[PDB]
Homo-oligomer: A and B are copies of this chain.
């Protein structure tokens, strides 16, 4: 099969930054969205306005998205070990600040099966 591309998202309100990520991810293979739960999101930022099921109804309908799975924690390891993607895609915002430790763990965990992180310039102004 095609490679598996894992994309973590809160995705409270979809905007062109998200679309950019998904468009870049689709270049790498079939996208599985790791849709973060309330509890995951609450652990590092403000809770979203929309519920998990509401956010899922939107994101599952974005072009390029093959599957959507819950990501119950900010940390990606448990999901990465289950789905074993070839790629993870994220914006470069998480090189600094609250998600940096989670980013480092994505790189180290993916190395276990030779997966790669691909980072995209964050879309400014939105």
Contact = CB atoms under 8 A, between A and B. Distances in A.
Interface of A: 13-16, 19, 22-23, 50, 54, 57-58, 61-64, 126
A50 B18 CA distance: 14
Contacts of A64: 61
Contact of A16 (B16, B19, B22, B54): B54
Contact of A54 (B15, B57, B63): B15
Contacts of A62: 61-63
| 4 A-B pairs with least C-beta separation | A16-B57, A61-B63, A19-B57, A13-B13
Contacts of A16: 54, 57-58
A37 to B, nearest CB: 17
Given A14-B58, A16-B57, A54-B126, 4 more contacts: A13-B13, A50-B126, A62-B62, A62-B63
